[PDB]
Amino acid sequence: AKHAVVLDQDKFDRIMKEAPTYRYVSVSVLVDRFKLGGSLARVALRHLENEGIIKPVSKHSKQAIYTRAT
Amino acid sequence: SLVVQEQGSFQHILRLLNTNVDGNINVVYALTTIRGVGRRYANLVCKKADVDLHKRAGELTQEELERIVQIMQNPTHYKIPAWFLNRQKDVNDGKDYHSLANNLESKLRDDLERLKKIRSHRGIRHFWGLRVRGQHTKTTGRRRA
RNA sequence: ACAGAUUGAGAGCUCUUUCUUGAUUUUGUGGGUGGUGGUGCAUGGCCGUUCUUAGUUGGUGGAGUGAUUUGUCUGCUUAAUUGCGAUAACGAACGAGACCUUAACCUACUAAAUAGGGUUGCUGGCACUUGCCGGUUGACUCUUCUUAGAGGGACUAUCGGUUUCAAGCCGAUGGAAGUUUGAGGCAAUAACAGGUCUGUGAUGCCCUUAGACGUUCUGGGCCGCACGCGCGCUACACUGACGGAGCCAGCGAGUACAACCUUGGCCGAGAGGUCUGGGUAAUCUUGUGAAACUCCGUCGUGCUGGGGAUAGAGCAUUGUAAUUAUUGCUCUUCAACGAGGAAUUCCUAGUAAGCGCAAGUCAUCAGCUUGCGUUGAUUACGUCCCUGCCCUUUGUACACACCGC
RNA sequence: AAAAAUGUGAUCUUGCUUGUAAAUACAAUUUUGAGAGGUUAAUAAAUUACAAGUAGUGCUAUUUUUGUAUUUAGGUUAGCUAUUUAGCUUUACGUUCCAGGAUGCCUAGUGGCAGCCCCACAAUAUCCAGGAAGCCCUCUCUGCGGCUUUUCAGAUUAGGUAGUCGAAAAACCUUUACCUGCUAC
Ligand SMILES: [Mg+2]
Ligand SMILES: [Mg+2]
Ligand SMILES: [Mg+2]
Ligand SMILES: [Mg+2]
Ligand SMILES: [Mg+2]
Ligand SMILES: [Mg+2]
Ligand SMILES: [Mg+2]
Ligand SMILES: [Mg+2]
Ligand SMILES: [Mg+2]
Ligand SMILES: [Mg+2]
Ligand SMILES: [Mg+2]
Known part of the structure; x- marks a missing residue:
């Protein structure tokens, strides 16, 4: 294993800081900027799409392209 | 569904049935890794337990583990055909x-x-x-x- | 020829037996008969290969005493000895082409409740105005799709260049079609000591020829494993895997003296059981709602949920018989393999590759095969570098022809 | 590392010329299936450690405070090639495997959304270029393919010659080469 699968509060905070920035957020992009692995990344992305912040471009399974507001 | 908030870090690698249950990953996968449990069987066990298959489950509870063990032990007592x-x-x-x-x-x-x-x-x-x-x-x- | 010993063995195979059977036979000697016995280098037929390449022939006439040769060829064309041309050659035949079958076009004909639609009846649901989707072989009518009969239609057509302004080729236009329109079927002369005497009551000769190398039963074996190569399948995942959901083909095939395909209903996690049908078949299986695909979710680049081998057990089915798992299903085991070196195969368009179906064999077994459709690219549209083959000119102590002498 | 202060004949720390104390472990897949005989020949590496002869510099430097640390971190060859600011391998040296110790520029980088957040590009040499398995080989623990043979034959094929293969006792660790086969109304 290459790590980047372990989950923390601190990690979450860093992820949050922040949804803003980055032209596009793609599970792939998230990993590996060395963030939480695949599923985790996806979850994070989903969360980010709750109330604004990052709006979508594509919606497909695994090809999930999102971009910053607004 | 949800990212694991809170401190976390509840035991990397658990020991169960004289064998190594791997931390994180998923309950089914752990079961498979044990010398004798397979995929479908593992899934069934998980279902019986009543834990989400989505969860990584190296942060599992003790009671749940016990239940799983019991299930493994006994086919006829529980609802296994x-x-x-x-x-x-x-x-x-x-x-x-x-x-x-x-x-x-x-x-x-x-x-x-x-x-x-x-x-x-x-x-x-x-x-x-x-x-x-x-x-x-x-x-x-x-x-x- | 019952009875038990006998016998693998309710093989009278026999030796224990002492009953049947009536001139079939049977004991010899001529004489056949059978043989998945031999020899394909004794043959037939069929097939493969030279070669699906472009080659082959003879009638005159000319050149040679002659074997022979020319025609049958410098060139340029063509997939083609295809043509145009040049010409002791002229006109011909075979082979190629034409031909045939199929694949494409037909709102133009002939046709249909075993093919499909339109109006309308009854009838289900909707919005609720008249309108939308349906279901019913209730009526009436149609032939576009369907089939499949008869025909047409493409001839490189029109135009442009290019080429001794020839054969042709190259590009635009139209056209269903402009690669010989695509794909095959057939396919010359001469052959090979290529294969098959284990398709053959096709067969020469030899062998064998009643304890057979005939037949026939029974149990195995073709499947064994230190290991080589040859077709193949499955994978090395993220263009994925797994779940759901969407959901579309074409070739076919399929029983009454058997047991075929088998929907539809219930049981079973499955496999598979059962009852019932429909079908001798554009009618029923069957729209074979085949896969690969498409959508939303779960794992995220870790020999991982990639990969599925070997394994153990049980549940099924086929058959007389399943251990040397027949095959299917259920759980469990999780091996090798992160795109493969030297080498070498196949391929030019609905092709390649992927994907499944399909019949063939078949009681049961698909990784095989002949077909089928579905998804559908990359790169040439050239050349003789290699490989093979073909010719020509050359050289030849070869002619059983370089495995030569 | 930061800081307050004691004291040493004011104080402080850049290496030069010497000899000894120690870390390159362990091995196995392989080497001709087991044992013995040689790390044959060759050969010490700068690396750390104490002290000299002081260029240095007076050698030895003590008593107490602040925090989990707050310190400054990361990485270099060797060969082949007219892909030569690039391509391919990438610790070679009997065959198979090896690793960095430090004089140093390193450098707290330049690019792509620098921002910490990942990608790639940039840090001469190297002193040694050294250690482990294997290392020309010879007797053993005494191996299975020879020695002849006699019996035959499988066959080798169109026919044949010469060799070769298969089943029975004694020391030693190829099924191919070559000769011979056919004609007019
Ligand atoms: Mg016979
Ligand atoms: Mg015969
Ligand atoms: Mg022959
Ligand atoms: Mg022969
Ligand atoms: Mg003549
Ligand atoms: Mg001639
Ligand atoms: Mg013209
Ligand atoms: Mg044709
Ligand atoms: Mg039908
Ligand atoms: Mg696995
Ligand atoms: Mg087969």
Whole structure:
């Protein structure tokens, strides 16, 4: 294993800081900027799409392209 | 669904049934990793327990683990059809049963011994260190145990 | 020829037996008969290969005493000895082409409740205005799709260049079609000591020829494994895997003296059981709602949920018989393999590759095969570098022809 | 590392010329299936450690405070090639495997959304270029393919010659080469 699968509060905070920035957020992009692995990344992305912040471009399974507001 | 908030870090690698349950990953996967549990069976066990298959589950609870262990131990007591098993129909006139760890290995060994004793064609083949289920070794598998 | 010993063995196979059977036979000697016995280098037929390449022939006439040769060729064309041309050659035949079958077009004909639609009846649901989707072989009518009969239609057509302004080729236009329109079927002369005497009551000769190398039963074996190569399949995952959901083909095939395909209903996690049908078949299986695909979710680049081998057990089915797993299903085991070196195969368009179906064999077994459709690219549209083959000119102590002498 | 202060004949720390104390472990897949005989020949590496002869510099430097640390971190060859600011391998040296110790520029980088957040590009040499398995080989623990043979034959094929293969006792660790086969109304 290459790590980047372990989950923390601190990690979450860093992820949050922040949804803003980055032209596009793609599970792939998230990993590996060395963030939480695949599923985790996806979850994070989903969360980010709750109330604004990052709006979508594509919606497909695994090809999930999102971009910053607004 | 949800990212694991809170401090976390609840034990990397758990020890269960004299074998290594791997941390994070998923309960089913852990079960599979144990010498004797497979995929479908693992899934079934998980279902019985009532835990999400989405969760990584190295942060599992103790009670849940215990329940799982119990399930592994006992086919007939819980709702498992009893033809879904590793072993079934064995000894003189009696019951179907299976193990899932070290226990499973032991059972297998016992079975092998029995076969050897019998000196059946299969048993003979086993003794030889050869091809029990009549597959043609004219060309294929040129190395062997 | 019952009875048990006998015998693998309710093989009278016999030796224990002492009953049947009536001139079939049977004991010899001529004489056949059978043989998945031999020899394909004794043959037939069929097939493969030279070669599906472009080659082959003879009638005159000319050149040679002659074997022979020319025609049958410098060139340029063509897939083609295809043509145009040049010409002791002229006109011909075979082979190629034409031909045939199929694959494409037909709102133009002939046709249909065993093919499909339109109006309308009854009838289900909707919005609720008249309108939308349906279901019913209730009526009436149609032939576009369907089939499949008869015909047409493409001839490189029109135009442009290019080429001794020839054969042709190259590009635009139209056209269903412009690669010989695509794909095959057939396919010359001469052959090979290529294969098959284990398709053959096709067969020469030899062998064998009643304890057979005939037949026939029974149990195995073709499947064994230190290991080589040859077709193949499955994978090395993220263009994925797994779940759901969407959901579309074409070739076919399929029983009454058997047991075929088998919907529809209930049981079973499955496999598979059962009852019932429909079908001798554009009618029923069957719209074979085949896969690969498409959508939303779960794992995220870890020999991982990639990969599925070997394994153990049980549940099924086929058959007389499943251990040397027949095959299917259920759980469990999780091996090798992170795109493969030297080498070498196949391929030019609905092709390649992927994907499944399909019949063939078949009681039961698909990784095989002949077909089928579905998804559908990359790169040439050239050349003789290699490989093979073909010719020409050359040289030849070869002619059983370089495995030569 | 930061800081307050005691004291040493004011104080402080850049290496030069010497000899001894120690870390390159362990091995196995392989080597001709097991044992013995040689790390044959060759050969010490700068690396750390104490002290000299002081260029240095007076050698030895003590008593007490602040924090989990707050310190400054990361990485270099060797060969082949007219892909020569690039391509391919990438610790070679009997065959198979090996690793960095430090004089140093390193450098707290330049690019792509620098921002910490990942990608790639940039840090001469190296002193040694050294250690482990294998290392020309010879007797053993005494191996299975020879020695002849006699019996035959499988055959080798169109026919044949010469060799070769298969089943029975004694020391030693190829099924191919070559000769010979056919004609007019
Ligand atoms: Mg016969
Ligand atoms: Mg015969
Ligand atoms: Mg022949
Ligand atoms: Mg022959
Ligand atoms: Mg003449
Ligand atoms: Mg001629
Ligand atoms: Mg013209
Ligand atoms: Mg044609
Ligand atoms: Mg039909
Ligand atoms: Mg696995
Ligand atoms: Mg087959």
